[PDB]
């Protein structure tokens, strides 16, 4: 008759369609040599809480947990990356690993709203492979997946945490603030911000702009004018990606991008659908994570938010 509220219900069609895409992506992933892995459904909460990012993504209040026999605190799959990162540590051969996953994560969201609790994701991880090769391989794949999804109007955005980080330090080290500013594109708070400080013309001109434009030429200049090696350097890496992947799909460069996670190493990227409010795909490189376990290696990957993608597929037909 009636099921709980914290349970999403997919319609046959939704299932048929979700199961289609999987087929396409599955064939694609297997072709690029990614091995699928199924993470345990329960994890020791100690594993999830050891994290705090640049926002709101790892609090014990979003996760469903309870007590086991010996009496410890276990939690329902809250994230896919970690377990795959762990798996990679348990390896005794220093070789690259190509993992992929097709499941859902369980996190709590307020009541009486279109917010879903059951989040079905599809994503891949890449551990150990070469530095540049890595970044390129993932960005490519990410674009390929988007082509198989079947959404009409989509955008692929990339960015640099270093550029972000650097930017921050140039802004009087006010990262706690600049971040809030960038997240809300709070234009009136940024102006106020700039007023209280004695920022150079260039830096000020740059801040003001990165919040509202991705036109390469325009940004290119603003950057080189800061005469800052770091900022110009990071920006050129993005430009390079823009150029190398331009033939596949027009890339967009968002310098005002705020690192979803506080551990992102440098490259970060997300793609949006004109028919969805949330991103259909997000990913980037996060070597840092590999550190919590095994040594320093190149870790990067993305994740597809199927719920949103399917939602976009419907709001799309209408």
């Amino acid at each position: 008759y009636l099921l709980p509220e914290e349970s999403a219900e997919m319609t046959l069609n939704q299932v048929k369609s979700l199961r289609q895409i999987e087929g396409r992506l599955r064939k694609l992933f297997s072709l690029k040599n990614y091995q699928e892995v199924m993470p345990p459904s329960f994890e020791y909460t100690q594993l999830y809480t050891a994290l705090e990012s640049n926002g709101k993504t790892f609090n014990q209040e979003k996760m469903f947990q309870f007590i086991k026999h010996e009496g410890q605190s276990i939690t329902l799959r809250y994230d896919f990356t970690l377990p795959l990162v762990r798996l990679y540590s348990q390896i005794k051969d220093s070789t690259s690993a190509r993992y992929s996953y097709f499941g859902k994560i369980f996190r709590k969201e307020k009541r009486h709203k279109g917010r879903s609790t059951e989040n079905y994701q599809i994503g891949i991880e890449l551990f150990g492979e070469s530095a540049d090769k890595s970044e390129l391989e993932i960005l490519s794949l990410a674009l390929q997946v988007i082509e198989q999804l079947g959404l009409n109007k989509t955008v692929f955005e990339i960015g640099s945490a270093k550029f972000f980080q650097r930017l921050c330090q140039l802004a009087d080290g006010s990262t706690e603030l600049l971040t809030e500013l960038l997240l809300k594109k709070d234009l009136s708070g940024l102006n106020a911000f700039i007023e209280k400080n004695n920022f150079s013309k260039e830096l000020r001109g740059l801040l003001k702009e990165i919040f509202i434009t991705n036109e390469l030429s325009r940004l290119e200049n603003l950057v080189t004018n800061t005469k800052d090696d770091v900022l110009i350097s990071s920006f050129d890496q993005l430009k390079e990606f823009s150029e190398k992947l331009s033939m596949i799909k027009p890339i967009i460069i968002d310098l005002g991008m705020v690192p979803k996670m506080d551990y992102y190493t440098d490259l970060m990227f997300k793609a949006y659908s004109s028919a969805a409010n949330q991103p259909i795909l997000s990913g980037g490189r996060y070597d840092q994570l590999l550190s919590n376990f095994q040594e320093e290696a190149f870790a990067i990957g993305f994740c597809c938010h199927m719920d949103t993608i399917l939602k976009a597929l419907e709001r799309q037909e209408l």
Binding site: L2, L3, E9, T11, L12, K113, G114
Partner: protein, 200 residues
């Protein structure tokens, strides 16, 4: 004395009115008061009148069934029930509603999620409730929801939007709720007023 709380809305009038038709010094001079009949009255929003009664801030409280049904509070007595007005919870929607048979669960927008839930429960149909605090008619208009559960009195609000009652949920009317402990001891006065308020 007897402490009463009344909802500021249209109900305040019904009450001040009924109190008049039965003799008690009506005082529409406000803009907490006392009467000659020992009635320290207080006013506020329904959910607030109830909150007052819950915390025993008052003994008697006059609210609408519509709120009592939505509010999760249950620890009170519903002695009298002045059947004034004609509001009714209903399920409104576009005419082509019942004829359309989609391939999934429907979404209803409502100011009363609990009632909306409770109703769709007896009807065997899990649904997505979207809450609206203002004008719920927009739900289906803007495309937010398929149907609505709101209080329909004259129906002048739905028709004007191209909506029609699909089914009557329940009858709505102003009620006289009383704090339990207050009734246990001040049972005389509370009953006396009930019997008087009833002659009208």
């Amino acid at each position: 004395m007897i402490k009463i709380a009344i909802t500021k809305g249209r109900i305040q009038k019904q009450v001040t009115k009924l109190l008049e038709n039965a003799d008690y010094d009506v005082e529409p001079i406000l803009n907490q008061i006392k009467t000659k009949d020992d009635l320290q009255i207080i006013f506020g929003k329904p959910n607030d009148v109830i909150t007052f009664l819950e915390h025993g801030i008052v003994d008697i409280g006059f609210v609408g069934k519509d709120t009592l049904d939505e509010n999760d509070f249950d620890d009170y007595y519903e002695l009298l029930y002045l059947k004034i007005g004609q509001c009714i919870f209903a399920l409104a929607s576009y005419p082509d509603f019942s004829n359309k048979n989609f391939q999934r669960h429907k979404r209803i927008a409502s100011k009363y999620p609990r009632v909306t839930k409770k109703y769709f429960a007896q009807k065997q149909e899990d649904i997505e409730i979207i809450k609206l605090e203002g004008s719920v008619e927009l739900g289906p208009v803007v495309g937010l929801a398929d149907a609505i559960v709101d209080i329909v009195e004259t129906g002048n609000t739905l028709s004007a939007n191209g909506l029609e009652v699909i089914e009557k949920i329940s009858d709505i009317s102003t009620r006289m709720i009383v704090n339990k402990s207050s009734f246990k001891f001040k049972k005389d006065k509370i009953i006396e007023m009930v019997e008087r308020l009833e002659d009208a």
